[PDB]
Design a protein around this ligand. Sequence first.
Ligand SMILES: CC1=C(/C=C/C(C)=C/C=C/C(C)=C/CN)C(C)(C)CCC1
Length: 140
Amino acid sequence: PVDFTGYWKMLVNENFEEYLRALDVNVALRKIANLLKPDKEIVQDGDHMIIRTLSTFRNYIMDFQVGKEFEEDLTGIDDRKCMTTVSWDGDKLQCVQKGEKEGRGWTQWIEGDELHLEMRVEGVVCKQVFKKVQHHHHHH
Ligand SMILES: CC1=C(/C=C/C(C)=C/C=C/C(C)=C/CN)C(C)(C)CCC1
């Protein structure tokens, strides 16, 4: 069965600038963010999912139950609040983020040693791929 648990290092990050612009992330933060190559530390614990998006400058932490709508605090990205639901779709994890922006959400899946993440908002698509890695680093 699909299990996202692991430590994952960014390999590619496609169209991130336009995704951030569509979120109205401020220009100075977009400049910082485009230099970053975040890791993902994921623990899948039953249907309790923790996805830590870790970078040298700032983190974004998700901690939620699959299937259950929750208030998602996007402080550090666009500082918005969404009413967010993450659901299994076969071997894919689907996320809908209800809020100010239309069409906001993402899909996550695994191909071999790769974690694939398609992020969407306002018809814009950013695609990230990470490689599963084994050398760990301490974090908060
Ligand atoms: C814009 C910005 C950032 C953007 C983070 C983003 C979009 C995280 C998306 C997380 C998702 C869908 C995770 C599901 N694997 C960092 C990495 C927190 C650094 C500070 C500035």
